């Protein structure tokens, strides 16, 4: 709920470049400034002879929102011989996937084609470039001597990537072995130390790779998506990967051991062609230090109230348990054909309540396919099934849908305000948007009505001016608040009380406030963080018995408190927000004594 949607940071790239197809954070290992990494896989480059080679842009923060390309490779195509190119970089989609860990940045071109040295071919093996700092090396683990579709010639290595916490790479190649797909994992140390530009197929020791299997597994697309997380409690991140054509289009998700690529766990979809496995994510969502698996099936069809199938998408949440099992739950999309679940982004603890949170994108929902992103907060039982926030794209396109939410990245506190922030790409409008998380104020409110029971016959209070004898009682409302992260010391609260709120339009209200002789009482207030329970008392009374003949329904004393957000701003311009999970209304009720 605490993401700032009023003034996000908006970044654009060249028209038609698919700027925003992939997004990440960059946190260099010098406690330096932080940047955004945005993939623009159809962008034109200065590489001689290359058309739409793609690029990865580094975008500054709070310095006029400027992006400059990262020079991974300035060169065009190498030649095997005169007029015989060794490789083909045009339309290679460099920047389709970008991942960064500390100093290192990994970006891949899943449609890079390579000729091979024996014959004239154009095999989309894919290639990646790894920039560790001053040094940049190529990393094309599928550009091997295992040629052709039956080998790794159509592997499209780099289709999906990730880093393990121990600086291993996880690479997905959905085309290997007649589209069985393949996962490959190499130590970054190997990737840079074994790099020799004179050798096109590099022998990395300690490489982990899935193996060719029986033909029945063809056309499964292993490596369509990947995530990492420990799932046998040995501290070594394991490999999660979506396999969306597996099990005759039901889809599957494989988990392999991050130490030997042994198979650990499997998930299987429930519906034909729901594209189960289009996206995967691993994050502890319920605060037990056991990573939990999220699997998106964007084309999943639901049964509607009328019994008609309706394509809304579905995400499954699998809570890891020490016993090795998983505790699975399903989450359904909201709009037809919106493809809820195309992207799943761990957010970290967005609201800093103790449980991590997650964003799930519906890139084709909203008005005129503008796209929608749903925020789901975690809790000890799992994921909160009702989204606490709804982000909506703001741009339309005249060619391809904006696809706001197609890519997302969170879990990085870019502005150092104490809460992680979210990047959302919208490649159909060549846009990427950073949403900063506002801080959260938790408020403890108490309301006391004494005496609880009211006797009409008992009158001890005098009315304002020159009037006498009204049955009275005391209403005391109290307020206390605190917050985490950069916050103002003083907070301006506005409180309102309503006596006998039960009685709606056209019905008599039996209780009135002494001074005001009205059933409502407003009150501005001011409380400081971590301060004491600043209270305030006022006195109410009852109407003459002659005016109301309902003495049976209780008299509820309703209290509301809200905040004016403009006054609490920061140097960032970031107003704090009230904790949405604690209700901002409280009510007690008094009763008329009967005889």
């Amino acid at each position: 709920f605490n993401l700032d949607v009023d003034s996000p940071a908006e970044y654009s790239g060249p028209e038609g470049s698919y700027f925003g197809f992939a997004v990440d954070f960059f946190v260099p290992s010098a406690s330096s400034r932080m940047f955004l990494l945005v993939g623009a896989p159809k962008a034109n480059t200065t590489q001689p002879g290359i058309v739409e080679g793609g690029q990865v842009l580094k975008c500054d923060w709070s310095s006029t929102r400027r992006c400059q390309p990262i020079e991974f490779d300035a060169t065009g195509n190498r030649d095997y011989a005169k007029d015989d190119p060794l490789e083909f970089k045009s339309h290679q989609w460099f920047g389709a996937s970008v991942r960064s860990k500390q100093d290192k940045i990994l970006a891949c071109a899943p449609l890079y084609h390579w000729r091979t040295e024996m014959k004239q071919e154009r095999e989309p093996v894919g290639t990646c470039f790894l920039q560790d700092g001053t040094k940049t090396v190529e990393y094309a683990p599928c550009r091997s001597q295992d040629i052709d579709a039956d080998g790794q010639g159509f592997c499209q290595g780099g289709f999906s990537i990730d880093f393990t916490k121990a600086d291993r790479v996880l690479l997905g190649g959905p085309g290997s072995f007649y589209w069985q797909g393949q996962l490959i994992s190499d130590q970054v140390a190997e990737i840079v130390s074994k790099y020799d530009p004179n050798v096109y197929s590099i022998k990395y020791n300690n490489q982990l790779a899935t193996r060719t299997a029986q033909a029945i597994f063809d056309d499964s697309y292993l490596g369509y998506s990947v995530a990492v997380g420990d799932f046998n409690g040995d501290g070594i991140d394991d490999f999660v990967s979506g396999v969306p054509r597996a099990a005759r289009t039901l889809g599957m998700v494989y988990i392999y051991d991050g130490k030997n690529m042994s198979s650990l766990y499997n998930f299987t979809g429930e519906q034909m062609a729901a594209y189960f496995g289009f996206s995967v994510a691993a994050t502890d969502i319920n605060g037990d230090d056991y990573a939990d698996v999220f699997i998106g099936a964007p084309l999943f069809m639901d049964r509607g109230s009328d019994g008609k199938l309706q394509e809304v998408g579905q995400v499954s949440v699998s809570l890891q348990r020490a016993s090795g099992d998983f505790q699975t739950t399903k989450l359904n999309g909201f709009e037809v054909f919106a493809r809820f679940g195309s992207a799943i982004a761990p957010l970290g603890d967005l609201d800093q309540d103790g449980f991590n949170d997650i964003a799930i994108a519906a890139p084709y929902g909203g008005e005129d396919k503008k796209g929608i992103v749903y925020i789901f907060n975690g809790r000890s039982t799992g994921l909160n099934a009702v989204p606490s926030q709804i982000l909506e794209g703001q741009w339309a396109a005249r060619s391809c849908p904006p696809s706001f939410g197609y890519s997302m990245k969170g879990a990085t506190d870019i502005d150092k305000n104490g809460y992680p922030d979210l990047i959302v790409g919208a490649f159909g409008v060549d846009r990427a948007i950073l949403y900063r998380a506002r801080p959260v104020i938790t408020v403890n409110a108490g309301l006391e009505v004494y005496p609880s029971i009211l006797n009409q016959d008992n009158k001890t209070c005098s009315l304002p001016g020159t009037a006498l004898k009204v049955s009275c009682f005391n209403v005391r409302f109290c307020l206390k608040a605190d917050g985490k992260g950069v916050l103002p010391r003083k907070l301006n609260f506005q409180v309102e009380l309503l006596l006998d709120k039960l009685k709606q339009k056209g019905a008599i209200r039996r209780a009135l406030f002494l001074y005001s002789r009205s059933p409502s009482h407003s009150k501005n207030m001011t409380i400081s963080r971590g301060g004491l329970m600043q209270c305030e008392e006022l006195i109410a009374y009852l109407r003459d018995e002659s005016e109301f003949r309902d003495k049976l329904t209780p008299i509820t004393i309703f209290m509301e408190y809200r905040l004016d957000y403009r006054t609490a701003a920061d140097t960032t311009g970031l107003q704090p927000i009230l904790n949405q999970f604690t209700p901002a209304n409280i009510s007690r009720q008094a009763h008329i004594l009967l005889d």
Partner: antibody, heavy 118, light 108 residues
Framework: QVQLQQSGAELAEPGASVKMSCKASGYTFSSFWMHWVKQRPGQGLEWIGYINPNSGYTECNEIFRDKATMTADTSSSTAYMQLSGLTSEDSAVYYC???????????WGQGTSVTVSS | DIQMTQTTSSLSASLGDRVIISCRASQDISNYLSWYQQKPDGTVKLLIFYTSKLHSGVPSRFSGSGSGTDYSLTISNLDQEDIATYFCQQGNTFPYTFGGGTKVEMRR
């Protein structure tokens, strides 16, 4: 830390067959071709051919077409060669060598001597 | 098939000397020539590939040059452990073919 370990010396009578192994370690055995080289005592290096371990496809020098058949067990990262119809002219050291690319073989086994006598 | 020929089958050299080993191909092999060292005990190493590319792990003393049909390996500052036999090998066309070799022995 690439290493190719070849099986021990082989003795076979004339007309028999032998089969030697070459176990790879330190790289992904499936992603690289394995070559085979013949060297007679005091003589030079002769090229037999190569195998694509993941597909079983092979190409041979015309000399050794009928004489040698190459195979590969990917589960054990082992390439095998079998010599058949053995003569005294087959007595030699037989090397396995991984394929670097660029028309070169970057790592060599220690060789397996084959002696053919009665 | 391409015939490779190392005209000198053997040569002598003292420590520190520069040894230049020659190799010639019957046809143009488009700079696809490699050099291998074989030691007395049968050990074989790759030294140079694609005419002038140094294989990882081998010392900078070894270097290779050439084009078209004529190529040469060069040992600068001959080390004791360089006493060996050196073969050239074209990789431009199948079948791969070697030169006869050139033995290097210490002068005495």
């Amino acid at each position: 830390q690439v290493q190719l370990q070849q099986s021990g010396a082989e003795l076979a009578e004339p007309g028999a067959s032998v089969k030697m192994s070459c176990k790879a370690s330190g790289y992904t055995f499936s992603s690289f071709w394995m070559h085979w080289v013949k060297q007679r005592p005091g003589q030079g290096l002769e090229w037999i051919g190569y195998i694509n371990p993941n597909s079983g496809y092979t190409e041979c020098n015309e000399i050794f077409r009928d004489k040698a058949t190459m195979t590969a067990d990917t589960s054990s990262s082992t390439a095998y060669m079998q010599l058949s119809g053995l003569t005294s002219e087959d007595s030699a050291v037989y090397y396995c060598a991984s394929f670097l690319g660029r028309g070169a073989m970057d790592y060599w086994g220690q060789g397996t001597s084959v002696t053919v006598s009665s | 098939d391409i015939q490779m020929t190392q005209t000198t089958s053997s040569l002598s050299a003292s420590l520190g000397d520069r040894v230049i080993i020659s190799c010639r191909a019957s046809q143009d092999i488009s700079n696809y020539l490699s050099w291998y060292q074989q030691k007395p005990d049968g050990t074989v190493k790759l030294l140079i590939f694609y005419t002038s590319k140094l294989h990882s792990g081998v010392p900078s003393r070894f270097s290779g040059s050439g084009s078209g049909t004529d190529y040469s390996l060069t040992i600068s500052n001959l080390d004791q452990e360089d006493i060996a036999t050196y073969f050239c090998q074209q990789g431009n066309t199948f079948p791969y073919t070697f030169g006869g070799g050139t033995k290097v022995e210490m002068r005495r």
